[PDB]
Symmetry: D2
Subunit: 334 residues, 4 copies
């Protein structure tokens, strides 16, 4: 139905493309990057993390062809030259990681697009949305540049919503043991973050994250109640959130998990998941939900301090949420 | 001075041997394992984690020779046949990981040894000691089988002591992002812990740990105040403790770090360290201290919740503490 | 059809089971290992290398239930106590790694089995077979303890066959950059092979291999003409054979690749495959063929020396060849 | 003595600096990259591969201060704006990776430099040199832009020299199982080489290499006789050359190894080394030689075909050869 365009056909760009294939309401008709159709086609066909694409892929002229459907391939470094309007693209997924500021993301709008979804925390966005938590705050009339937050926030926000509405959160701190990403470095190179400058596959790398505070963006009641950090480790994909929080009401482990399980089977079905299996990160590769509670890890002290651990395929979960948001926005009128 | 014997010449056994080379008060005269002198000599000479041994190594007869010093090599599976007494071994470092129960560890005593140091949490030990925290509780007259706890507890205990004596700990939870060890599995094999059964270098593996509760063994005041877990990740060595705790007194980040830094330069010098550099796990390989505070990671909410992150070379730090304990015990009289 | 038993439900054991699900001529009614049905069921369902098994898996008291069918679980360290005869098991896949010698493998026969397939190079086996190369040499009346060779031999033999019949091999040498396996070590531990004693996920590890020599067991004409080595590297699965050989007939790269391709689309279809894609090891995880030619790597000098590179999923290709062999052996009468 | 400048303070840049500290004939007075003195100082002090630099490192306003000496830090993306002449820099090590073509490298000369050492295979260089093989061909009056070849060529050339002079090489093919480098990608990203575009730490990655052909630049007699490929694997450093060659003279493994050993203890000492130890890649990290023969791997068939395996720390060996070359070039007059 709605024509979509992806700017930055990378880990998120391609994952989003695959998710879109499952939703007949959104049609990805064009992608943009900094290489040729040949290369983008080869990357989409063979993925080191998610395997071989289950569809026919070819190159026709200077474009891609997926299961007979033709996808326009652009290679414009400057978003202003994307002419999205010219080909009827209404929604643009900004996943280059270079245009998180509104002044840059808005270039897609000048190019003819109607809505822009920044696939990451943003700067001066009209609004930040986490599906299953605050999509209702989206306002078609004023929100044109939207942020889908980070995968980490998308994992924490949902169960943080549950703990707070069910038991009340006084304060809490989190740590996300996160798989390395392309923002890091192969072997000790310059980086604004002296931590991320170090060989990604050789160390446990502590780094700062705003995912905790960003939760306040979608859950205002929690402003100033959370903070945390990240630890990048030697895994190519799949991460996990570890939250330690002080609760108002007195509770037991069973209660906490019971609340989380009910929410996952209820109002958060498809967003929050609940597992009582003793699994590891590899088992969650391909997971489409935003957050799966590792129930066996639930822990409580004095009935006031709790530890909740949740899994998330940082590439997949988030990309599926991007498509949900794109469909949600389209259904609101363009 | 005191003759030492090492049972289980592995990651800890060999690391302990190297540490002993630096202390003229302890002399390691015999090691036992399940292989031949040739093999143990080759392992001691070339280490994948700590590099080539800086000393001359050879094999003479059925024994090892390190810088001209001869080390007896035994290959007795059953500790009772070690005849430590016959060669004058008074202290035995039990690092096979198979004899953590007192009934097994005591076999070294029947063999003629006077004291046994179990290099891990134990079962029914006469006492568990963490150097810099409770070595004063050691009683030469009644403590013959001693536990040096785990490397994780050795990392947490010291700064937990400081936070509690300085600000008072109501309760706290910790998570140790830990390098894989030989207790794990290369590729999905049977293991009592269905988590540790999974390919160690391919996933982030959540696992349970008693390091938090074990802190109570050396710091009785903290009984029932702590609990936590571990996450084994794809790194061959070096781990980090992440503690989230509720404090009694109201404090600031600067205060917390100031207290930790003073303790590291004071009463805990050589045990607790303090760093304000943005480093990663590889930078701590070879670290001899038990715990180095990553000050930049210190974080506080409402002046009541704090996050303290500390580094520890799980093999090296602990092994150096084993030698300290052996010397400490010897100085108490055998 | 013919009932099979798996002794050693490990990487090959469980992969052999997966393949058997697709082969109507064979049925797995029992497996034996050193643990409980709950551990094996958990391992069968969650695989760090091949993902979640696409089938119903549960535990029936003391047995496994896969897609309704009930699999009997044994835990006999001694093959002589398996009593295969009491459950009608005719063919036993010996994949423990401990019974590669006929004296030991033959115990399954004493236990009621009729044929034993050793999943690896063996000692004193009645015959060594490489599917697609010499299954014709199989003698139902004389061969009871059969070896399915190694996965490396299964990868090399098929195209070595093609090269020799088509151009004649004077002599050659190979190196297989092979993924690590459970025969190695996590962190420097005793091992008969001092190279394999070293941390598997940390180095490139040269180790000897008899795969090249073994080719002669299935292709007599190549006796004494081939030799090689292995290099274990930090990947969990998938390997590649690198053969450099002197040919009798003068050839060009195009002619060598054409012969390999024709053989793959002809007589060796399903056993040998041919690829002109610039792929990497991760791309062959799950591959069921025994050998896939990496055509872009084919090289020639003076029209006499050639380099042929072929990929292989050491777990899947081999495990499927084992099932193929079991079905073949059965079609000959037991 | 002669003042040197390093353009590109990366893996080779910083390793070249470490080696220069030990060479009295050369002094590094300035380095150029794309960041601030604080970033470079932090990278120089903490290395994920080679550990903490054993020296005093600090920042003096806008420059580096190593063991007292002050190093000027530049940040000019355009080599033409380096003004080496104004600071007396005579020799410049071009190790950015972006200026391997003479048209670009020659800019340093236009900037006041007298000689330029390109740390890699080059295009239109006045001459390519492999230390210990053909430095004699150097012409101070005609050669201004010199290439120090690749680390792979530096590893292969020295023993290829020995084999040819001693037995005569008819033809051969090599494969270098090489550690990943910064030229690769963290997670499937565009790259001219579709193989190198794939996650470096997740697969075995075949890639082309001109190292074998390049040998002819330093050993004319071997022109058109050698060829090969590379296989990038999941290790951060250290590589190994695997050469299979047809010899003119009939030989035994013992004679080949004896020749290699004699050459290592003779004319090629310090360049070529010989080892009879069963080591692994981690053992050669820090090795300063260009090539170390793994004698246990030497193999021969029909007394004519031989396989020689040699190790090399692609970062350290090469970087030291660069310093050696710089000192040599200087001893010839600038
Ligand atoms: N990787 C994760 O787990 C994850 C999860 C959620 C959100 N994100 C966010 O999504 C964004 C992209 O992340 P990624 O991991 O996919 O990165 P990536 O580096 O893998 O992909 C980025 C793609 O954008 C292209 N690109 C860069 N500049 C371009 C330009 N100017 N014009 C057009 N194309 C250009 C690159 O060629 C590349 O293919 C970031 O903002 C990041 O923080 C990442
Ligand atoms: N690895 C760490 O980071 C770490 C840190 C602190 C404490 N520990 C503890 O120390 C112990 C050993 O750990 P490791 O990592 O060195 O293990 P390891 O497996 O590397 O070494 C154990 C050694 O003991 C030998 N051994 C086993 N059974 C034997 C027997 N019956 N008799 C004689 N020798 C035998 C093995 O051959 C091996 O060399 C464990 O209890 C463990 O929990 C480990
Ligand atoms: N992994 C590969 O790439 C590969 C490929 C081809 C052939 N092989 C061969 O197959 C065999 C097994 O290899 P793997 O990788 O599956 O090993 P593995 O260690 O993963 O599996 C072996 C299984 O056998 C069990 N076992 C051990 N002793 C036992 C006993 N006495 N009785 C019953 N069960 C016992 C273990 O518990 C384990 O689950 C070896 O001979 C090996 O060389 C391995
Ligand atoms: N890494 C090895 O194993 C190895 C061995 C031998 C030769 N080499 C060669 O040496 C060169 C560099 O390799 P590396 O591994 O050190 O790479 P690297 O990426 O680690 O280092 C390159 C450095 O150059 C800097 N740089 C890039 N453009 C610049 C510019 N225009 N001006 C100034 N600085 C700039 C980067 O910031 C970086 O720090 C390559 O040509 C490579 O082929 C690498």
């Amino acid at each position: 139905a709605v024509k979509v365009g992806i700017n930055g056909f990378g880990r998120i760009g391609r994952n989003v493309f695959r998710a879109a294939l499952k939703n007949p309401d959104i049609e990805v008709v064009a992608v943009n990057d900094l290489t040729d159709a040949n290369t983008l086609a080869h990357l989409l066909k063979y993925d080191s993390v998610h395997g071989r694409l289950d569809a026919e892929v070819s190159v026709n002229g200077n474009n891609l062809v997926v299961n007979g459907k033709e996808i326009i391939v652009k290679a414009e470094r400057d978003p202003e030259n994307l002419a999205w309007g010219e080909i009827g693209v209404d929604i643009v997924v900004e996943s280059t990681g270079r245009f998180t500021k509104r002044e840059d993301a808005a270039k897609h709008l000048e190019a003819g697009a109607k809505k822009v979804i920044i696939s990451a925390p943003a700067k001066n966005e009209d609004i930040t949305i986490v599906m299953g938590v605050n999509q209702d705050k989206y306002d078609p009339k004023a929100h044109h540049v939207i942020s889908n937050a980070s995968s980490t926030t998308n994992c924490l926000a949902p169960f943080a919503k549950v703990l707070h509405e069910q038991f009340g959160i006084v304060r809490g701190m989190m740590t996300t043991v996160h798989s390395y990403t392309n923002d890091q470095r192969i072997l000790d190179l310059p980086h604004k973050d002296l931590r991320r400058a170090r060989a990604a596959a050789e160390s446990i790398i502590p780094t700062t994250t705003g995912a905790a505070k960003a939760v306040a963006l979608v859950l205002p009641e929690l402003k100033g109640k959370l903070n945390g950090m990240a630890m990048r480790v030697p895994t190519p994909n799949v991460s996990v959130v570890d939250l330690v929080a002080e609760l108002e009401k007195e509770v037991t482990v069973e209660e906490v998990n019971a609340a989380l399980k009910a929410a996952a089977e209820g109002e958060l079905k498809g967003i929050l998941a609940y597992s009582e299996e003793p699994l590891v990160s590899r088992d969650y590769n391909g997971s489409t939900v935003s957050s799966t509670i590792d129930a066996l890890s639930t822990m409580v002290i004095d009935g006031k301090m709790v530890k909740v651990v949740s899994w998330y395929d940082n590439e997949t979960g988030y990309s599926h949420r991007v498509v949900d948001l794109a469909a949600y926005i389209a259904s609101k009128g363009l």
